[PDB]
């Protein structure tokens, strides 16, 4: 049963696929990262709200530990900053999509201007507007269209984050 | 294994803490069945920094109802300071029926000041959910709804829980070796 | 420049005349339509010494008419008490901080036999013992730790109750 | 926005000019007791007089740079209704009054005290009516002010106007 009936037009990834994926990127950031010698854990800093699904299946599929951090930030400005130095630290941006790039390329300059020992970004979603953009994404789950997507941590007006699987919406709901 | 000799052994596996879950959101379910089609709101799931984290993103997608996130952040009792929100909510919840999601109640005084403050901010409905309840909590004076598993005293850290920001990423519930703690 | 015995701040003075704003415009909020139908003024009861500094910020926060009123109890016995009669009257207990109850709970029994309309507390500061015994309380600006703290009213042996902030005192001394 | 709408004829002064001048009054006896306590090593006492004094006893306190402490005491209209809770023999005095009108409050209250035999006593009055620029001498006057009734600031009628921030006088209506 539709948990938000009429509301999904088409599925654009499964839960099972998004699962899948996270499995393959934990496995793949966990051989890059193999704190044995700098002494401390991988840093992963969330993007809130997207990203929050993604992060905590993402750090339990990272098969070296990590630590936890969530940031939130507008449409330039901090609404919620770090508990955190991450000095010296390495980091890694977790996001749940990136478009335009210019959430990505600000959240970059803020976290670089701490000094870290790192910064590296993982996105579960990229879109074609990326391109354009000129920060550096290490990780990325799935390239997808263009199209506005819900779900996953993904809301359309803090609706529908807390769907299983990622789909586009039927146009009747931005009325 | 993540933290090689550090855990001393498991209170709960990663099997049995989604088992739990699952009940969890399902029993939540029922009693918010018609929350959406009556009040047009979805339930509102607040989290506190950082334990409920992983908690609270598995009991979402355990509870068959829409529910919507928002995340706050307290400051500890310990000189910590008073007691202040660090990282507060993005949205309103006047008129709202809210649940608080929490890792663990223990001595209840986190819970006590979170209750005091979101009350005040005058939603529909306020009620606790925790994953663990721990025996100093039958002191505590907030009411709580949905209790995950009640556990012994000890520290455990896994899903959630830390030790000085460590072992919050492992899938399971355990106990930490002297050597550390 | 800070006193010797002063670890650290607590509270700055804009902290807590930010928090005493908004208890000011609340407690109004609540007084208000009530106090135009009796006709009596909002009586604040101020227990000595340490709630002298937080009542005259306080009153002046408050955007309704209120009438100030001092008591002085041990640690039993009535120092100073009432000057008036608060038969009928409507009465807020003013206090620095709450820890065990125990001089709200003695406070409270001894003003509500006098017959107030209403009786209810504000507390500048309220320590966790307080909340663990689930002490009723309408009013409070700050949840603290059990630290030992001075200032705004707060003192130690008489000393520090004229700072502008509230500190916690350095544990080398107490 | 009046706390009591039509009460107040007109504000004879405002918030701002009593803060301010509570500043100065701070400083001046901050400058007057800071090598005079560090003798002795006991802070300056502080006794206010109820009720109307404790408005200015809890700004001026915070603008004196040196410790001090606080003493409360009410007396009638003249005996004592509360006393001193602590000896102050050899300590430094300062009384902190609202208003000296006639001055046989602060007549009566400076020879009770002096009784005591503390090490200095001094007189401090945030208004000061002109019978009384005249028995006792004050070291520390907020301000001169003509004969007229006023409230607010502490200053009361009938127990009421103490909780307005600044002093004015009343409507002749309100002495109905
Ligand atoms: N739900 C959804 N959101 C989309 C989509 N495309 C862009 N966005 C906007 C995602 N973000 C929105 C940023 N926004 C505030 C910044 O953190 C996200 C807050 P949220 O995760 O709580 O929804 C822009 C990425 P970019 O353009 O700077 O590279 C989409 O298909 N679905
Ligand atoms: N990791 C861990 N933490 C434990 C445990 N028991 C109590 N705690 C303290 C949990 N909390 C700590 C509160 N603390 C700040 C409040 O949000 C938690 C911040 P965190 O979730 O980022 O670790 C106390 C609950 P209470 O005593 O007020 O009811 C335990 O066994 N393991
Ligand atoms: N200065 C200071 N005092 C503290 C503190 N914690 C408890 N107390 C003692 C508070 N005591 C003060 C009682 N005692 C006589 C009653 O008015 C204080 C007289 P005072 O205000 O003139 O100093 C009552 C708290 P409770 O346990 O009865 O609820 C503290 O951090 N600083
Ligand atoms: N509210 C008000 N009161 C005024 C005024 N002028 C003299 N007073 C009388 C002030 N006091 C009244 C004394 N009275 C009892 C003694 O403490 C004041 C009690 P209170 O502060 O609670 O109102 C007389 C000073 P003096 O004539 O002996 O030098 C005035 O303009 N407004
Ligand atoms: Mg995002
Ligand atoms: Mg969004
Ligand atoms: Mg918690
Ligand atoms: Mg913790
Ligand atoms: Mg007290
Ligand atoms: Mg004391
Ligand atoms: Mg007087
Ligand atoms: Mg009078």
């Not at 950031?29 to 193999?34: A, E, L, S, V």
């Not at 300059?109 to 074609?128: A, D, E």
Request: charged fraction near 25%.
């Amino acid at each position: 049963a539709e948990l938000y009936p009429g509301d999904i037009k088409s599925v654009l990834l499964t839960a099972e696929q998004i699962q899948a994926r996270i499995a393959e990127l934990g496995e793949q950031i966990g051989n890059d990262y193999r704190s044995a010698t700098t002494g401390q854990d991988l840093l992963l800093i969330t993007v809130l709200k997207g990203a929050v699904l993604f992060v905590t299946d993402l750090a339990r599929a990272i098969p070296v530990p990590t630590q936890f951090e969530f940031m939130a930030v507008s449409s330039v400005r901090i609404l919620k900053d770090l508990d955190r130095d991450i000095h010296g630290r390495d980091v890694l941006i977790v996001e749940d999509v990136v478009d335009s790039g210019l959430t990505l390329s600000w959240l970059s300059r803020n976290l670089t201007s701490r000094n870290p020992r790192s910064l590296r970004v993982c996105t579960l979603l990229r879109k074609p507007d990326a391109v354009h953009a000129n920060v550096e994404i290490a990780y990325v789950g799935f390239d997808i269209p263009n199209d506005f997507v819900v779900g996953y941590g993904l809301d359309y007006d803090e609706r529908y984050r807390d769907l299983s699987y990622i789909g586009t919406l039927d146009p009747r709901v931005y009325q």
